[PDB]
Design a protein around this ligand. Sequence first.
Ligand SMILES: Cc1cc(C)n2nc(CC(=O)N3c4nc5ccccc5n4C[C@@H]3C)nc2n1
Ligand SMILES: [Mg+2]
Ligand SMILES: [Zn+2]
Length: 324
Amino acid sequence: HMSICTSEEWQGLMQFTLPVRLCKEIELFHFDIGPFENMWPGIFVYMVHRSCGTSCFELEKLCRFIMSVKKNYRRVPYHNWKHAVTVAHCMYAILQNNHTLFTDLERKGLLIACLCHDLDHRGFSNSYLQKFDHPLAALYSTSTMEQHHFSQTVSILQLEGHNIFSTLSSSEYEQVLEIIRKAIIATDLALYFGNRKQLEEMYQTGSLNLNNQSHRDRVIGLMMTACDLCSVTKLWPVTKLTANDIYAEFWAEGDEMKKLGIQPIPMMDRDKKDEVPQGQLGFYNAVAIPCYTTLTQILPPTEPLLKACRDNLSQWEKVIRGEE
Ligand SMILES: Cc1cc(C)n2nc(CC(=O)N3c4nc5ccccc5n4C[C@@H]3C)nc2n1
Ligand SMILES: [Mg+2]
Ligand SMILES: [Zn+2]
């Protein structure tokens, strides 16, 4: 039930080289993958190679892997291929700027997990599938989509000629898969609030210890979250755009509820469009800013994300006060 790429696709990938002019910009946090759709898979490989060295993975098995992932993203307005790459990029920037805080095994795991984190998203929220009464919530009933996303990854990983991790030891294999699982589950926004509070705590009392694996997992998790929301960290006109994308889904979900004579929350109601800027404000203020603030504290080199967030915040304020 997994979908595979054709030899044409993956072989195309292998032959791609990145234009020299992007080499610089790719290293920047606010870098936008938007205007380079064909290059997306190629851009992932590049990031893999630079982070983890050129022969970290048998290039052949890697390219098949990436194109198959692509094919299992659906054609929805936001939780799509583009999202997966954008998020994976953001993690690349994070890893790059903290290069020795993490292991080869973490960096392989995390870029992979990012690319895989929303695999086979249907544009329906966790709340929806549970609240009426999908076969998926009938299988995992906390963090529904996220457990599916991980299962999907594993399925793709177990496909013929696709196993990029094959040449690890079986102990290392079972570790990276662990890393990944925790990383993906962490993107359930429900878990983030608990997780950031815990971190907030540990940092403030100076009991945060990157040698303690449990702490490691929470710092990783926060990263995953930071990466997931990173649209808010692009330059205003990019962010503005990405917003319409996230809303299109929300309102498609809202519509599907209205069809069962159920009133959607205002966020998912396209008849409540003018409330949007305000909603951003709220989201930036209760979610985004706290996310990046805590990340910047733990990982000072990730400060530019926070800075870009704040700039977008005040653009939303300017929109509300009516100056855009
Ligand atoms: C990446 C990402 C992920 C998520 C879940 N959101 N959610 C938001 C917006 C949001 O949370 N709000 C929001 N917008 C609204 C728009 C209209 C009406 C009510 C609205 N409300 C209520 C609430 C304050 N922006 C996000 N961006
Ligand atoms: Mg998700
Ligand atoms: Zn996501």
